[PDB]
Protein backbone atom coordinates (compact mmCIF):
# COMPACT_ATOMS: atom_id res chain seq x y z
CA UNK A 1 0.00 0.00 0.00
CA UNK A 2 1.92 2.95 -1.44
CA UNK A 3 0.57 5.46 1.09
CA UNK A 4 2.58 4.11 4.06
CA UNK A 5 5.81 5.40 2.45
CA UNK A 6 4.34 8.75 1.35
CA UNK A 7 4.54 11.99 3.44
CA UNK A 8 1.53 12.68 5.68
CA UNK A 9 -0.48 15.28 3.81
CA UNK A 10 -4.02 15.22 5.18
CA UNK A 11 -6.69 14.28 2.62
CA UNK A 12 -10.11 13.52 4.13
CA UNK A 13 -10.82 14.63 7.71
CA UNK A 14 -13.76 12.93 9.45
CA UNK A 15 -16.61 15.06 10.84
CA UNK A 16 -16.64 15.29 14.65
CA UNK A 17 -13.20 13.65 14.88
CA UNK A 18 -10.20 14.30 17.11
CA UNK A 19 -8.36 15.78 14.13
CA UNK A 20 -11.32 18.02 13.20
CA UNK A 21 -12.05 19.28 16.74
CA UNK A 22 -8.40 20.29 17.19
CA UNK A 23 -8.46 21.96 13.77
CA UNK A 24 -6.58 19.70 11.34
CA UNK A 25 -7.21 20.76 7.72
CA UNK A 26 -6.91 19.09 4.28
CA UNK A 27 -3.46 20.11 3.02
CA UNK A 28 -1.73 20.06 6.44
CA UNK A 29 1.51 18.09 6.55
CA UNK A 30 2.19 16.23 9.81
CA UNK A 31 5.90 16.24 10.69
CA UNK A 32 5.95 15.30 14.40
CA UNK A 33 3.77 13.84 17.16
CA UNK A 34 5.04 13.78 20.81
CA UNK A 35 8.57 12.88 20.40
CA UNK A 36 8.39 10.78 17.20
CA UNK A 37 9.71 12.06 13.87
CA UNK A 38 6.86 11.74 11.35
CA UNK A 39 8.09 11.79 7.74
CA UNK A 40 5.68 9.12 6.46
CA UNK A 41 2.25 7.56 7.19
CA UNK A 42 4.06 4.44 8.45
CA UNK A 43 5.88 6.53 11.08
CA UNK A 44 2.58 8.07 12.20
CA UNK A 45 0.88 4.67 12.28
CA UNK A 46 3.75 3.11 14.24
CA UNK A 47 3.97 6.16 16.53
CA UNK A 48 0.27 6.34 17.49
CA UNK A 49 0.36 2.63 18.35
CA UNK A 50 3.40 3.14 20.62
CA UNK A 51 1.97 6.29 22.28
CA UNK A 52 -1.26 4.39 23.06
CA UNK A 53 0.68 1.44 24.50
CA UNK A 54 2.60 3.95 26.64
CA UNK A 55 -0.70 5.35 27.96
CA UNK A 56 -0.03 8.87 26.65
CA UNK A 57 -3.39 10.67 26.77
CA UNK A 58 -2.49 14.07 25.25
CA UNK A 59 0.60 15.26 23.38
CA UNK A 60 2.00 17.87 21.01
CA UNK A 61 1.60 17.71 17.22
CA UNK A 62 3.61 19.65 14.61
CA UNK A 63 2.33 20.26 11.07
CA UNK A 64 3.13 22.51 8.06
CA UNK A 65 0.24 24.67 6.82
CA UNK A 66 1.43 27.07 4.06
CA UNK A 67 5.03 26.10 4.90
CA UNK A 68 4.58 27.47 8.45
CA UNK A 69 5.10 25.09 11.38
CA UNK A 70 2.13 25.17 13.80
CA UNK A 71 1.84 23.64 17.28
CA UNK A 72 -1.25 21.73 18.47
CA UNK A 73 -2.38 19.65 21.44
CA UNK A 74 -4.03 16.41 20.38
CA UNK A 75 -5.88 13.62 22.21
CA UNK A 76 -3.98 10.41 21.49
CA UNK A 77 -6.60 7.88 20.24
CA UNK A 78 -6.97 4.50 21.97
CA UNK A 79 -5.94 2.21 19.09
CA UNK A 80 -7.18 -0.82 21.05
CA UNK A 81 -10.70 0.45 21.81
CA UNK A 82 -10.88 1.27 18.08
CA UNK A 83 -10.38 5.06 18.13
CA UNK A 84 -8.57 6.99 15.38
CA UNK A 85 -7.44 10.54 14.60
CA UNK A 86 -9.83 10.70 11.63
CA UNK A 87 -7.35 11.66 8.91
CA UNK A 88 -6.81 9.94 5.56
CA UNK A 89 -4.19 10.16 2.75
CA UNK A 90 -4.77 12.16 -0.44
CA UNK A 91 -6.74 10.38 -3.16
CA UNK A 92 -4.81 11.40 -6.30
CA UNK A 93 -7.32 12.24 -9.13
CA UNK A 94 -6.48 9.48 -11.61
CA UNK A 95 -8.97 8.02 -14.10
CA UNK A 96 -9.55 4.32 -13.40
CA UNK A 97 -11.97 3.79 -16.29
CA UNK A 98 -13.82 5.68 -19.04
CA UNK A 99 -17.40 4.80 -20.04
CA UNK A 100 -17.74 3.77 -23.70
CA UNK A 101 -19.40 6.49 -25.79
CA UNK A 102 -19.37 8.99 -22.89
CA UNK A 103 -18.26 12.65 -23.38
CA UNK A 104 -14.89 11.69 -21.86
CA UNK A 105 -14.50 8.82 -24.32
CA UNK A 106 -15.50 11.12 -27.20
CA UNK A 107 -12.65 13.55 -26.39
CA UNK A 108 -10.28 10.65 -25.76
CA UNK A 109 -9.67 10.65 -22.00
CA UNK A 110 -7.93 7.36 -21.09
CA UNK A 111 -7.46 5.22 -17.92
CA UNK A 112 -4.27 6.32 -16.14
CA UNK A 113 -4.81 10.03 -16.90
CA UNK A 114 -4.26 12.51 -14.07
CA UNK A 115 -6.52 15.56 -13.88
CA UNK A 116 -4.39 18.52 -12.82
CA UNK A 117 -6.92 21.33 -13.27
CA UNK A 118 -10.67 21.75 -13.86
CA UNK A 119 -12.07 24.92 -15.46
CA UNK A 120 -8.79 26.70 -14.66
CA UNK A 121 -8.62 25.66 -10.98
CA UNK A 122 -5.95 23.20 -9.79
CA UNK A 123 -7.15 20.09 -7.93
CA UNK A 124 -5.33 17.47 -5.82
CA UNK A 125 -8.11 14.95 -5.10
CA UNK A 126 -10.85 12.95 -6.82
CA UNK A 127 -13.38 14.57 -4.44
CA UNK A 128 -12.43 18.03 -5.77
CA UNK A 129 -12.83 16.77 -9.35
CA UNK A 130 -16.36 15.54 -8.62
CA UNK A 131 -17.19 18.87 -6.92
CA UNK A 132 -16.07 21.00 -9.88
CA UNK A 133 -17.74 18.72 -12.45
CA UNK A 134 -21.12 18.71 -10.69
CA UNK A 135 -21.25 22.47 -10.14
CA UNK A 136 -20.68 23.30 -13.82
CA UNK A 137 -23.94 21.46 -14.54
CA UNK A 138 -24.44 21.20 -18.31
CA UNK A 139 -21.79 23.78 -19.27
CA UNK A 140 -18.55 22.80 -21.03
CA UNK A 141 -15.75 21.57 -18.74
CA UNK A 142 -12.04 22.12 -19.42
CA UNK A 143 -9.54 19.58 -18.07
CA UNK A 144 -5.75 19.78 -17.88
CA UNK A 145 -4.30 16.27 -17.99
CA UNK A 146 -0.93 14.66 -17.32
CA UNK A 147 -0.67 11.49 -19.44
CA UNK A 148 2.12 8.89 -19.40
CA UNK A 149 5.73 9.08 -18.25
CA UNK A 150 7.75 12.01 -19.54
CA UNK A 151 10.96 11.71 -21.53
CA UNK A 152 14.01 11.76 -19.16
CA UNK A 153 14.97 15.40 -18.57
CA UNK A 154 11.48 16.58 -19.48
CA UNK A 155 9.43 15.55 -16.38
CA UNK A 156 9.03 19.19 -15.29
CA UNK A 157 8.13 20.70 -18.67
CA UNK A 158 5.20 23.11 -18.51
CA UNK A 159 2.83 21.61 -21.07
CA UNK A 160 -0.39 19.72 -20.54
CA UNK A 161 -3.11 18.03 -22.55
CA UNK A 162 -6.16 20.31 -22.57
CA UNK A 163 -9.57 18.72 -23.17
CA UNK A 164 -13.00 20.35 -23.40
CA UNK A 165 -16.09 18.21 -22.92
CA UNK A 166 -19.81 18.84 -22.53
CA UNK A 167 -21.64 16.81 -19.82
CA UNK A 168 -24.43 14.53 -21.01
CA UNK A 169 -27.80 14.07 -19.31
CA UNK A 170 -28.63 10.45 -18.52
CA UNK A 171 -32.06 9.83 -20.20
CA UNK A 172 -33.45 7.92 -17.18
CA UNK A 173 -32.25 9.94 -14.20
CA UNK A 174 -31.72 13.32 -15.86
CA UNK A 175 -28.29 13.34 -14.18
CA UNK A 176 -25.27 15.01 -15.79
CA UNK A 177 -22.24 12.78 -16.35
CA UNK A 178 -18.92 12.86 -18.22
CA UNK A 179 -18.13 9.14 -17.84
CA UNK A 180 -15.03 8.95 -15.56
CA UNK A 181 -14.66 6.08 -13.09
CA UNK A 182 -12.13 6.34 -10.18
CA UNK A 183 -8.97 4.20 -9.98
CA UNK A 184 -9.91 1.05 -8.03
Amino acid sequence: PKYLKEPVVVGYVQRDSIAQKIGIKPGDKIIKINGYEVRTWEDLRDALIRLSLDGVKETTLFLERNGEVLHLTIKVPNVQKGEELGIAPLVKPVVGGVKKGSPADQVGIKPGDLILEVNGKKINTWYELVEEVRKSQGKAIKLKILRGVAMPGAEDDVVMIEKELIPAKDPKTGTYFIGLFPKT
Binding site: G97, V98, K99, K100, F181
Partner: protein, 217 residues
Protein backbone atom coordinates in the same frame (compact mmCIF):
# COMPACT_ATOMS: atom_id res chain seq x y z
CA UNK B 1 -48.07 -37.77 4.14
CA UNK B 2 -47.20 -37.35 7.82
CA UNK B 3 -46.85 -33.67 8.74
CA UNK B 4 -46.04 -32.06 12.10
CA UNK B 5 -46.03 -28.27 12.38
CA UNK B 6 -45.10 -26.41 15.56
CA UNK B 7 -45.95 -22.88 16.60
CA UNK B 8 -45.81 -20.66 19.66
CA UNK B 9 -42.09 -19.98 20.09
CA UNK B 10 -40.34 -16.64 20.68
CA UNK B 11 -38.56 -14.78 23.49
CA UNK B 12 -39.58 -14.68 27.16
CA UNK B 13 -37.99 -13.57 30.40
CA UNK B 14 -36.70 -16.05 33.03
CA UNK B 15 -39.58 -17.13 35.27
CA UNK B 16 -42.23 -16.65 32.56
CA UNK B 17 -44.39 -19.18 30.70
CA UNK B 18 -44.85 -20.15 27.05
CA UNK B 19 -47.07 -22.71 25.32
CA UNK B 20 -45.98 -24.65 22.23
CA UNK B 21 -48.40 -26.22 19.73
CA UNK B 22 -47.89 -29.07 17.30
CA UNK B 23 -50.46 -29.59 14.52
CA UNK B 24 -50.52 -33.15 13.17
CA UNK B 25 -51.96 -34.62 9.97
CA UNK B 26 -51.60 -37.55 7.57
CA UNK B 27 -52.11 -40.36 10.10
CA UNK B 28 -54.63 -41.48 12.73
CA UNK B 29 -53.71 -39.00 15.46
CA UNK B 30 -55.23 -40.91 18.38
CA UNK B 31 -53.30 -44.09 17.50
CA UNK B 32 -49.91 -42.68 18.52
CA UNK B 33 -48.00 -41.10 21.37
CA UNK B 34 -46.63 -37.61 20.83
CA UNK B 35 -43.45 -36.09 22.29
CA UNK B 36 -41.27 -33.00 22.57
CA UNK B 37 -37.48 -33.12 22.06
CA UNK B 38 -35.24 -30.06 22.30
CA UNK B 39 -31.77 -29.22 20.98
CA UNK B 40 -28.99 -26.80 21.88
CA UNK B 41 -25.55 -26.68 20.13
CA UNK B 42 -24.00 -27.51 23.52
CA UNK B 43 -26.09 -30.44 24.74
CA UNK B 44 -27.37 -32.11 21.52
CA UNK B 45 -30.88 -33.66 21.42
CA UNK B 46 -32.73 -33.97 24.73
CA UNK B 47 -36.09 -35.63 25.35
CA UNK B 48 -38.33 -33.47 27.53
CA UNK B 49 -41.89 -34.87 27.40
CA UNK B 50 -44.15 -37.64 26.03
CA UNK B 51 -47.92 -38.23 26.06
CA UNK B 52 -49.55 -41.64 25.41
CA UNK B 53 -51.93 -42.25 22.48
CA UNK B 54 -55.13 -41.85 24.55
CA UNK B 55 -53.77 -38.86 26.50
CA UNK B 56 -53.97 -40.55 29.89
CA UNK B 57 -50.25 -41.07 30.57
CA UNK B 58 -47.50 -38.43 30.57
CA UNK B 59 -43.71 -38.65 30.99
CA UNK B 60 -41.10 -35.95 31.53
CA UNK B 61 -37.34 -35.51 31.32
CA UNK B 62 -35.59 -34.86 34.63
CA UNK B 63 -34.85 -31.19 33.96
CA UNK B 64 -38.49 -30.24 33.29
CA UNK B 65 -40.54 -32.63 35.44
CA UNK B 66 -42.74 -30.34 37.53
CA UNK B 67 -42.39 -27.24 35.30
CA UNK B 68 -43.64 -28.47 31.93
CA UNK B 69 -46.95 -30.14 31.16
CA UNK B 70 -47.80 -31.98 27.95
CA UNK B 71 -51.41 -32.38 26.76
CA UNK B 72 -53.23 -33.35 23.54
CA UNK B 73 -56.58 -32.57 21.91
CA UNK B 74 -57.50 -35.45 19.60
CA UNK B 75 -60.32 -33.42 18.02
CA UNK B 76 -57.85 -30.80 16.79
CA UNK B 77 -55.10 -33.35 15.95
CA UNK B 78 -52.92 -31.08 18.08
CA UNK B 79 -50.70 -31.48 21.13
CA UNK B 80 -49.22 -28.84 23.42
CA UNK B 81 -46.31 -28.24 25.78
CA UNK B 82 -47.01 -25.69 28.51
CA UNK B 83 -43.68 -24.45 29.85
CA UNK B 84 -43.55 -22.64 33.21
CA UNK B 85 -40.70 -21.19 35.31
CA UNK B 86 -38.44 -20.96 32.26
CA UNK B 87 -34.66 -20.61 32.70
CA UNK B 88 -31.73 -19.55 30.48
CA UNK B 89 -30.95 -23.23 29.89
CA UNK B 90 -34.40 -23.92 28.41
CA UNK B 91 -33.35 -21.76 25.46
CA UNK B 92 -33.33 -24.30 22.63
CA UNK B 93 -34.98 -25.46 19.43
CA UNK B 94 -38.06 -27.51 20.33
CA UNK B 95 -39.15 -30.36 18.05
CA UNK B 96 -42.43 -32.21 18.23
CA UNK B 97 -42.23 -35.89 17.30
CA UNK B 98 -44.64 -38.76 16.70
CA UNK B 99 -43.83 -42.16 18.21
CA UNK B 100 -44.08 -45.67 16.79
CA UNK B 101 -43.80 -47.81 19.93
CA UNK B 102 -39.99 -47.87 20.11
CA UNK B 103 -38.78 -44.77 18.25
CA UNK B 104 -39.63 -41.30 16.95
CA UNK B 105 -40.75 -41.95 13.39
CA UNK B 106 -41.44 -38.33 12.33
CA UNK B 107 -40.24 -34.88 13.51
CA UNK B 108 -41.48 -31.27 13.30
CA UNK B 109 -39.58 -28.30 11.83
CA UNK B 110 -38.64 -27.12 15.32
CA UNK B 111 -39.38 -23.78 16.96
CA UNK B 112 -36.82 -21.60 18.72
CA UNK B 113 -37.52 -20.54 22.30
CA UNK B 114 -35.24 -17.95 23.89
CA UNK B 115 -35.32 -17.35 27.65
CA UNK B 116 -33.51 -14.07 28.16
CA UNK B 117 -33.95 -10.77 29.97
CA UNK B 118 -32.64 -9.05 26.81
CA UNK B 119 -35.31 -7.38 24.71
CA UNK B 120 -36.68 -8.30 21.29
CA UNK B 121 -35.09 -6.18 18.58
CA UNK B 122 -36.55 -6.15 15.09
CA UNK B 123 -33.98 -6.01 12.25
CA UNK B 124 -33.29 -3.15 9.88
CA UNK B 125 -33.48 -4.46 6.33
CA UNK B 126 -31.17 -2.75 3.81
CA UNK B 127 -31.10 -3.43 0.03
CA UNK B 128 -27.76 -4.51 -1.44
CA UNK B 129 -27.19 -3.68 -5.10
CA UNK B 130 -23.71 -3.89 -6.74
CA UNK B 131 -21.65 -0.71 -7.10
CA UNK B 132 -21.42 0.58 -10.69
CA UNK B 133 -18.39 -0.37 -12.80
CA UNK B 134 -17.51 -0.16 -16.50
CA UNK B 135 -18.51 -3.68 -17.55
CA UNK B 136 -21.82 -5.43 -16.86
CA UNK B 137 -21.90 -9.20 -16.36
CA UNK B 138 -24.45 -11.65 -17.79
CA UNK B 139 -25.58 -12.51 -14.24
CA UNK B 140 -26.05 -10.18 -11.27
CA UNK B 141 -26.11 -10.92 -7.54
CA UNK B 142 -28.42 -8.88 -5.31
CA UNK B 143 -28.44 -8.85 -1.53
CA UNK B 144 -30.56 -8.12 1.55
CA UNK B 145 -28.80 -6.96 4.76
CA UNK B 146 -30.70 -8.03 7.87
CA UNK B 147 -29.11 -6.11 10.67
CA UNK B 148 -29.17 -6.06 14.47
CA UNK B 149 -32.03 -8.40 15.36
CA UNK B 150 -32.62 -10.47 18.47
CA UNK B 151 -33.37 -13.26 18.85
CA UNK B 152 -32.89 -15.83 16.06
CA UNK B 153 -34.29 -16.76 13.64
CA UNK B 154 -35.08 -14.74 10.56
CA UNK B 155 -36.26 -16.12 7.22
CA UNK B 156 -35.64 -14.49 3.85
CA UNK B 157 -37.53 -15.25 0.66
CA UNK B 158 -37.29 -13.46 -2.67
CA UNK B 159 -40.40 -12.43 -4.61
CA UNK B 160 -42.46 -14.42 -2.07
CA UNK B 161 -40.62 -17.64 -2.97
CA UNK B 162 -40.89 -17.22 -6.76
CA UNK B 163 -37.08 -16.94 -6.85
CA UNK B 164 -35.93 -20.23 -5.32
CA UNK B 165 -32.70 -21.23 -7.06
CA UNK B 166 -29.60 -19.06 -6.75
CA UNK B 167 -30.80 -18.03 -3.28
CA UNK B 168 -28.32 -18.12 -0.40
CA UNK B 169 -29.24 -16.99 3.09
CA UNK B 170 -25.92 -16.75 4.95
CA UNK B 171 -25.87 -17.68 8.70
CA UNK B 172 -25.77 -14.70 11.07
CA UNK B 173 -22.91 -13.15 13.03
CA UNK B 174 -23.45 -12.27 16.68
CA UNK B 175 -22.04 -8.98 17.94
CA UNK B 176 -23.05 -7.20 21.17
CA UNK B 177 -26.17 -9.34 21.60
CA UNK B 178 -27.50 -8.65 18.09
CA UNK B 179 -27.50 -10.83 15.00
CA UNK B 180 -26.77 -9.68 11.47
CA UNK B 181 -27.07 -11.69 8.28
CA UNK B 182 -27.30 -11.37 4.53
CA UNK B 183 -29.37 -13.16 1.93
CA UNK B 184 -28.30 -13.09 -1.71
CA UNK B 185 -30.05 -14.01 -4.95
CA UNK B 186 -28.41 -14.41 -8.34
CA UNK B 187 -30.53 -13.50 -11.35
CA UNK B 188 -29.86 -12.88 -15.09
CA UNK B 189 -29.17 -9.18 -15.65
CA UNK B 190 -32.19 -9.24 -17.98
CA UNK B 191 -34.58 -10.25 -15.16
CA UNK B 192 -33.42 -7.33 -13.00
CA UNK B 193 -33.74 -4.91 -15.93
CA UNK B 194 -37.38 -5.92 -16.55
CA UNK B 195 -38.90 -7.32 -13.32
CA UNK B 196 -38.88 -6.23 -9.67
CA UNK B 197 -36.68 -8.13 -7.21
CA UNK B 198 -37.87 -7.98 -3.60
CA UNK B 199 -36.48 -9.62 -0.47
CA UNK B 200 -39.00 -10.66 2.19
CA UNK B 201 -37.58 -10.72 5.71
CA UNK B 202 -39.62 -12.23 8.54
CA UNK B 203 -38.68 -11.98 12.21
CA UNK B 204 -41.12 -14.15 14.26
CA UNK B 205 -40.11 -12.88 17.72
CA UNK B 206 -40.88 -9.26 16.83
CA UNK B 207 -43.87 -10.26 14.68
CA UNK B 208 -42.40 -8.31 11.77
CA UNK B 209 -42.24 -8.88 8.04
CA UNK B 210 -40.43 -6.47 5.70
CA UNK B 211 -40.41 -6.45 1.89
CA UNK B 212 -37.60 -4.44 0.28
CA UNK B 213 -37.20 -3.94 -3.48
CA UNK B 214 -33.68 -3.83 -4.91
CA UNK B 215 -33.09 -0.89 -7.29
CA UNK B 216 -29.85 0.08 -9.20
CA UNK B 217 -27.74 2.65 -7.33
Amino acid sequence: EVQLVESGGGLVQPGRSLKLSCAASGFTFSNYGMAWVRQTPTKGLEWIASISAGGDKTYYGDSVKGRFSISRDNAKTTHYLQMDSLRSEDTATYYCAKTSRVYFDYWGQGVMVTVSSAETTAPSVYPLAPGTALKSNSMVTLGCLVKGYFPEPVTVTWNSGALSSGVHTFPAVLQSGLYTLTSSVTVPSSTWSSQAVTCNVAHPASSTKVDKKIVPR
